[PDB]
Amino acid sequence: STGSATTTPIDSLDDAYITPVQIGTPAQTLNLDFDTGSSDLWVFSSETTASEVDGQTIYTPSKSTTAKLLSGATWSISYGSSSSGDVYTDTVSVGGLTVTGQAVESAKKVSSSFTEDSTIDGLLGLAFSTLNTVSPTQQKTFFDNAKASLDSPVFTADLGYHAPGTYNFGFIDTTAYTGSITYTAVSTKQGFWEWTSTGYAVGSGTFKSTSIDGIADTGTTLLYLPATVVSAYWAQVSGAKSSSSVGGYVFPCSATLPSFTFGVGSARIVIPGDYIDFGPISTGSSSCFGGIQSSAGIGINIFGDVALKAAFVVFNGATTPTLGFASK
Numbered sequence: 001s002t003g004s005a006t007t008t009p010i011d012s013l014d015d016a017y018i019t020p021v022q023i024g025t026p027a028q029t030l031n032l033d034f035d036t037g038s039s040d041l042w043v044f045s046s047e048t049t050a051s052e053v054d055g056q057t058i059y060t061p062s063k064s065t066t067a068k069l070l071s072g073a074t075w076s077i078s079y080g081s082s083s084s085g086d087v088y089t090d091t092v093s094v095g096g097l098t099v100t101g102q103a104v105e106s107a108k109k110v111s112s113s114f115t116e117d118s119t120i121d122g123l124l125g126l127a128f129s130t131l132n133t134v135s136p137t138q139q140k141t142f143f144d145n146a147k148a149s150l151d152s153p154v155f156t157a158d159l160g161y162h163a164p165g166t167y168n169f170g171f172i173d174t175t176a177y178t179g180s181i182t183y184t185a186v187s188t189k190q191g192f193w194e195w196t197s198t199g200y201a202v203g204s205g206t207f208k209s210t211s212i213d214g215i216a217d218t219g220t221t222l223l224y225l226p227a228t229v230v231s232a233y234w235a236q237v238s239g240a241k242s243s244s245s246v247g248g249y250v251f252p253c254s255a256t257l258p259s260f261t262f263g264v265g266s267a268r269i270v271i272p273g274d275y276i277d278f279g280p281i282s283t284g285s286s287s288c289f290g291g292i293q294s295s296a297g298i299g300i301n302i303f304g305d306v307a308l309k310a311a312f313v314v315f316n317g318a319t320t321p322t323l324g325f326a327s328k
């Protein structure tokens with residue numbers, strides 16, 4: 001089997017992407033944030049504290065003939081945002097690919113940032129199932145459940161810049177990228193799609209060969225890299241500075257940003273400068289927020305949407321997982 005679904009930015013900055021997901025019988029379609037950095041499929045629901053729902057579409061398990069309470073199971077996750085609740089199993093379909101008996105984690109509580117974002121009805125985790133938070137019986141991700149049935153045990157992320165893109169399951173669309181896909185090793189020890197970039201360049205500058213361990217994370221907006229790398233980038237933008245009050249690098253909105261290149265083995269992925277602009281820090285400001293930020297304090301580097309959207313990315317879930325990157 002295969003599936004293919006379009007993923008759409010939630011706003012004009014590409015702060016996140018939503019993908020329609022069919023849950024239950026008859027189908028209830030919710031728009032979920034596909035997150036390769038976590039492993040829970042959770043939804044706003046009829047059980048969510050009423051004051052914490054503001055415009056989201058909810059899953060109502062009592063209206064699904066295939067829903068079954070997973071007795072005794074609870075979940076709780078943090079991302080400063082958080083959510084928690086209980087668990088059903090139900091039929092879940094993404095882009096024509098159906099999994100029966102998928103754990104659908106129903107939110108009883110969500111933090112303010114979720115409530116405040118009307119466009120995201122929940123999360124669909126695509127990291128390794130070892131990170132799943134359901135207790136006392138850990139549950140599998142949608143991909144883990146589907147894998148055996150897929151034509152090939154892979155999914156791909158093809159995120160758009162200020163435009164829709166695609167998540168495919170079970171096949172690689174050879175028309176969706178240019179050149180070849182370069183594959184690179186993955187460590188699953190922390191539960192993430194963790195890999196090592198071979199270095200970087202800023203603008204038209206020379207490539208610096210240096211190992212940068214990090215995660216391929218569709219659920220993080222920005223590109224978080226070591227302070228040395230990030231300083232080298234922003235030093236090429238007149239007037240850019242790190243602002244403790246704002247919480248990262250800002251730059252004059254009048255700037256033209258340089259590109260940023262990262263290495264995948266001997267291959268190179270170029271992030272255009274425009275992708276690194278996250279717009280005014282507050283409405284009407286001439287100070288703009290940067291899309292490349294320091295990972296110092298996080299504990300891990302994060303190749304979030306800013307980086308991933310510049311590539312066609314293969315999440316290869318074969319017995320020894322790997323990641324593939326192509327230009328597009």
Ligand SMILES: N=C(N)c1ccc(C(F)(F)F)cc1
Binds near residue numbers: 035038079
């Ligand atoms: N995409 C996510 N859900 C996510 C959240 C937190 C981290 C960490 F704290 F480890 F940095 C990494 C990834």
